[PDB]
Coordinates of C-alpha atoms in Angstrom, one line a residue:
Chain A
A1 CA 109.6 81.2 40.4
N2 CA 107.8 79.8 43.4
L3 CA 104.5 80.6 41.8
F4 CA 105.4 78.6 38.7
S5 CA 106.6 75.8 40.9
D6 CA 103.4 75.7 42.9
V7 CA 100.7 74.7 40.4
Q8 CA 100.4 71.1 39.4
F9 CA 99.2 71.0 35.7
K10 CA 102.0 70.6 33.2
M11 CA 103.1 73.8 31.5
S12 CA 103.8 74.1 27.8
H13 CA 105.4 77.6 27.9
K14 CA 106.4 79.7 30.9
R15 CA 106.7 83.4 30.4
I16 CA 107.2 86.2 33.0
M17 CA 106.3 89.8 32.1
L18 CA 107.9 92.6 34.1
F19 CA 106.3 96.1 34.2
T20 CA 108.9 98.7 35.2
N21 CA 110.9 101.5 33.8
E22 CA 113.6 101.8 36.4
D23 CA 116.1 100.6 33.8
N24 CA 118.7 100.2 36.6
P25 CA 116.9 98.4 39.4
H26 CA 119.6 99.6 41.9
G27 CA 122.8 101.3 41.2
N28 CA 123.4 101.6 44.9
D29 CA 123.8 98.0 46.3
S30 CA 125.9 96.0 43.8
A31 CA 125.4 92.8 45.8
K32 CA 121.7 92.9 45.2
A33 CA 122.4 93.2 41.4
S34 CA 124.9 90.3 41.5
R35 CA 122.4 88.1 43.1
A36 CA 119.9 89.3 40.5
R37 CA 122.0 88.1 37.6
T38 CA 122.6 84.8 39.5
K39 CA 118.9 84.1 40.2
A40 CA 117.8 85.3 36.8
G41 CA 120.3 83.1 35.0
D42 CA 118.9 80.2 37.1
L43 CA 115.4 80.9 36.0
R44 CA 116.7 81.0 32.5
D45 CA 117.9 77.4 33.1
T46 CA 114.9 76.1 35.1
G47 CA 112.8 76.3 31.9
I48 CA 111.4 79.8 32.5
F49 CA 111.7 82.8 30.1
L50 CA 111.5 86.4 31.2
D51 CA 110.5 89.5 29.4
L52 CA 110.2 93.3 30.0
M53 CA 108.6 95.9 27.9
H54 CA 110.2 99.3 28.5
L55 CA 107.0 101.2 29.3
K56 CA 108.0 104.9 29.6
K57 CA 110.5 107.1 31.4
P58 CA 112.0 110.6 31.1
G59 CA 115.3 109.4 29.9
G60 CA 116.3 106.1 31.4
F61 CA 114.9 104.2 28.4
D62 CA 117.7 101.7 27.7
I63 CA 118.1 97.9 28.0
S64 CA 121.9 97.5 28.0
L65 CA 121.8 98.9 31.5
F66 CA 121.5 95.7 33.6
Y67 CA 118.9 94.0 31.3
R68 CA 120.9 93.0 28.2
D69 CA 121.8 89.8 30.1
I70 CA 118.2 89.2 31.4
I71 CA 115.7 89.3 28.6
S72 CA 115.9 87.1 25.5
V73 CA 118.0 99.6 19.6
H74 CA 115.9 101.3 22.2
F75 CA 113.4 104.2 22.9
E76 CA 111.1 105.5 25.6
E77 CA 108.1 103.2 24.7
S78 CA 107.8 99.6 23.7
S79 CA 106.2 98.5 20.5
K80 CA 106.1 95.1 22.2
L81 CA 103.4 96.4 24.6
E82 CA 101.2 98.0 21.9
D83 CA 100.3 94.6 20.3
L84 CA 99.2 93.4 23.8
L85 CA 96.4 95.8 23.3
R86 CA 95.3 94.4 19.9
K87 CA 92.3 93.0 21.9
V88 CA 91.6 89.9 19.8
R89 CA 89.0 87.2 20.5
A90 CA 90.3 84.3 18.4
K91 CA 90.7 80.8 19.8
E92 CA 93.2 78.1 19.0
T93 CA 93.9 74.4 19.3
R94 CA 97.3 72.9 19.2
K95 CA 98.8 70.4 16.7
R96 CA 95.8 68.2 17.2
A97 CA 95.6 65.1 14.9
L98 CA 92.0 64.9 13.7
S99 CA 92.6 61.2 12.8
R100 CA 95.6 59.1 12.0
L101 CA 94.9 56.7 9.1
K102 CA 97.3 54.4 7.3
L103 CA 97.6 55.3 3.7
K104 CA 98.3 52.1 1.8
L105 CA 99.6 52.3 -1.8
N106 CA 98.3 48.8 -2.5
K107 CA 97.3 45.8 -0.4
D108 CA 100.9 45.5 0.9
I109 CA 102.6 48.9 1.0
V110 CA 101.2 51.0 3.8
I111 CA 102.3 54.4 5.1
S112 CA 101.3 56.4 8.2
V113 CA 99.4 59.6 7.5
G114 CA 98.0 62.1 10.0
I115 CA 94.8 63.7 8.7
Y116 CA 95.0 67.2 10.1
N117 CA 92.6 70.1 9.8
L118 CA 93.5 73.6 8.6
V119 CA 90.1 75.3 8.4
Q120 CA 87.2 74.4 10.7
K121 CA 84.4 77.1 10.7
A122 CA 84.4 77.8 14.4
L123 CA 80.9 77.9 15.9
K124 CA 79.9 79.7 19.1
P125 CA 80.8 77.7 22.2
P126 CA 77.8 75.4 23.1
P127 CA 75.7 77.0 25.8
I128 CA 75.1 75.2 29.1
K129 CA 71.6 75.0 30.6
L130 CA 71.4 76.7 34.0
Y131 CA 68.8 76.8 36.8
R132 CA 66.9 80.1 36.8
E133 CA 67.7 81.5 40.4
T134 CA 70.4 79.2 41.4
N135 CA 72.6 79.4 38.3
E136 CA 73.6 75.8 38.9
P137 CA 74.1 73.2 36.2
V138 CA 71.0 71.2 35.4
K139 CA 72.3 67.9 34.1
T140 CA 69.9 67.1 31.3
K141 CA 68.4 63.6 31.7
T142 CA 66.6 62.8 28.4
Chain B
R1 CA 140.7 103.6 22.3
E2 CA 139.8 100.1 21.2
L3 CA 142.5 98.5 23.2
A4 CA 141.3 100.4 26.3
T5 CA 137.8 99.1 25.7
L6 CA 139.2 95.6 25.3
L7 CA 140.9 96.2 28.6
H8 CA 137.5 97.1 30.1
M9 CA 135.8 94.0 28.7
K10 CA 138.5 91.7 30.1
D11 CA 137.9 93.6 33.4
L12 CA 134.3 92.6 33.1
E13 CA 135.2 89.0 32.4
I14 CA 137.6 88.8 35.5
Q15 CA 134.8 90.4 37.6
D16 CA 132.4 87.8 36.3
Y17 CA 134.9 85.3 37.5
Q18 CA 135.4 86.6 41.1
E19 CA 132.1 88.2 42.1
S20 CA 129.8 85.5 40.8
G21 CA 132.0 82.8 39.4
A22 CA 132.9 81.9 43.0
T23 CA 136.5 81.1 42.1
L24 CA 140.0 82.5 42.9
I25 CA 143.4 82.3 41.3
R26 CA 147.1 81.8 42.3
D27 CA 147.0 85.5 43.3
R28 CA 150.3 86.1 41.4
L29 CA 148.6 87.3 38.2
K30 CA 146.0 89.7 39.6
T31 CA 145.7 92.8 37.4
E32 CA 144.2 96.2 38.3
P33 CA 140.9 97.1 36.7
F34 CA 141.5 99.2 33.7
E35 CA 140.8 102.9 33.5
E36 CA 142.2 105.1 30.7
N37 CA 142.4 108.3 32.7
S38 CA 144.9 107.0 35.2
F39 CA 146.7 105.0 32.5
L40 CA 147.2 108.2 30.5
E41 CA 148.4 110.2 33.5
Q42 CA 151.0 107.6 34.4
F43 CA 152.0 107.1 30.8
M44 CA 152.6 110.9 30.4
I45 CA 154.3 111.2 33.8
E46 CA 156.7 108.2 33.4
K47 CA 156.9 106.8 29.9
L48 CA 156.3 109.9 27.7
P49 CA 159.8 111.5 28.1
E50 CA 161.0 108.5 26.1
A51 CA 157.7 107.6 24.3
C52 CA 157.8 110.6 22.0
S53 CA 161.6 110.8 21.5
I54 CA 162.6 111.8 18.0
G55 CA 166.1 110.4 18.2
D56 CA 167.9 109.5 14.9
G57 CA 164.6 108.6 13.2
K58 CA 165.8 105.0 13.7
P59 CA 162.9 103.9 15.9
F60 CA 160.4 105.7 13.6
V61 CA 161.7 103.8 10.5
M62 CA 161.6 100.6 12.4
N63 CA 158.4 100.6 14.3
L64 CA 155.7 101.9 12.1
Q65 CA 156.8 101.9 8.4
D66 CA 154.2 99.2 7.9
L67 CA 151.4 101.5 9.2
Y68 CA 153.1 104.3 7.2
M69 CA 152.7 102.3 4.1
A70 CA 149.1 101.3 4.9
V71 CA 147.9 104.8 5.5
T72 CA 149.8 106.1 2.5
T73 CA 147.8 103.5 0.4
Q74 CA 144.5 104.5 2.1
Chain C
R1 CA 152.4 98.5 23.5
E2 CA 151.7 99.1 27.2
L3 CA 148.0 98.5 26.9
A4 CA 148.8 95.3 25.0
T5 CA 151.1 94.1 27.8
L6 CA 148.4 94.9 30.2
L7 CA 145.9 92.9 28.2
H8 CA 148.4 90.0 28.2
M9 CA 148.6 90.3 32.0
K10 CA 144.8 90.1 32.0
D11 CA 144.9 87.1 29.6
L12 CA 147.3 85.4 32.1
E13 CA 144.8 86.2 34.9
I14 CA 141.8 84.9 32.9
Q15 CA 143.6 81.7 31.8
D16 CA 144.4 81.2 35.5
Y17 CA 140.7 81.0 36.1
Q18 CA 140.2 78.8 33.0
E19 CA 142.7 76.2 34.1
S20 CA 140.7 75.4 37.2
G21 CA 136.9 75.7 37.2
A22 CA 135.6 79.2 36.9
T23 CA 132.8 78.8 34.5
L24 CA 131.3 82.0 33.0
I25 CA 127.8 82.9 34.1
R26 CA 126.9 85.8 31.8
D27 CA 126.9 84.1 28.4
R28 CA 127.8 87.4 26.7
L29 CA 131.0 88.5 28.5
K30 CA 133.4 86.2 26.5
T31 CA 136.6 87.8 25.3
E32 CA 138.9 86.1 22.8
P33 CA 142.5 85.9 23.9
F34 CA 144.5 89.0 22.9
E35 CA 147.1 88.7 20.2
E36 CA 148.2 91.9 18.5
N37 CA 148.8 90.9 14.9
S38 CA 145.3 89.8 14.1
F39 CA 143.8 92.9 15.6
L40 CA 146.2 95.2 13.8
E41 CA 145.0 93.3 10.7
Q42 CA 141.3 93.8 11.5
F43 CA 142.2 97.5 12.2
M44 CA 143.7 97.6 8.7
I45 CA 140.7 96.1 7.0
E46 CA 137.6 97.2 8.9
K47 CA 138.4 100.6 10.3
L48 CA 141.7 101.9 9.1
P49 CA 140.0 103.7 6.1
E50 CA 137.5 105.6 8.3
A51 CA 140.2 106.2 10.9
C52 CA 143.1 107.6 8.8
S53 CA 140.8 109.9 6.9
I54 CA 142.3 113.3 7.1
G55 CA 139.0 115.2 6.6
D56 CA 139.0 118.8 7.6
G57 CA 141.3 118.6 10.6
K58 CA 138.4 118.4 13.0
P59 CA 139.3 115.1 14.8
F60 CA 142.8 116.3 15.4
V61 CA 141.8 119.4 17.2
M62 CA 139.0 117.5 19.0
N63 CA 140.9 114.6 20.5
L64 CA 144.7 114.9 20.2
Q65 CA 145.3 118.4 21.7
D66 CA 146.1 116.9 25.1
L67 CA 148.9 114.8 23.6
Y68 CA 149.9 117.7 21.4
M69 CA 150.5 120.0 24.3
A70 CA 152.2 117.2 26.2
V71 CA 154.6 116.4 23.3
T72 CA 155.3 120.1 22.9
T73 CA 156.2 120.2 26.6
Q74 CA 158.5 117.1 26.4

């Protein structure tokens, strides 16, 4: 939570990924677990989501044990982690209005239309010219 | 069985009220957390001598004839 | 009947919390107030068929022998 709080740029989505298989974090000190529900519920209400993929464990592969109230049946490995290996190189841009133009039926009726783009033919990112030993930017000055 | 598990879920709710809800009550309605093993031992030690009494068949024909009918139908 | 009166004791205790503060933290621990008739009804509809199925006598020997021996003793 402190880490999310620290950085200054505005955040669109905020997700936490746990990596653990100790499906009961502690069956020994109940007070720790009570404070765990409390703080986790707080994070759920500070705008932050949380997520675990049950990686692997001999037995102990359940989520109703202390985590049904945390994350947003069950087995020993998570399909949710397999896709995080799909290893893709796409790139995306958000709902970016290419240009808003006012469609006018005639000289008097005008409506507001957002010309958006749904296929763009991505090109390779434009290269930047660098100095030969110093790898510094070179600031073209034509 | 289902009524015992309902007892356990209401135990969970009351626990949510005290341990994390940071609230108390009038202390006159506090109920023991439910466990079916004790409940059964006490029922069979105290209540059972009268709980299973055949009698005149009077209590039978009053208390359950509805369930009697329902299960006959099923 | 006794489990039901216990659940009403528990309902009294929970309503005691509900009258003054005591907000629920875990948004999945809610329990509807206990009233016998409606649950007997849902027992009739949803699960009475599977329950009252006689089958091959297995569930009886499985689960009820404790009460069987107890009732024989009483």
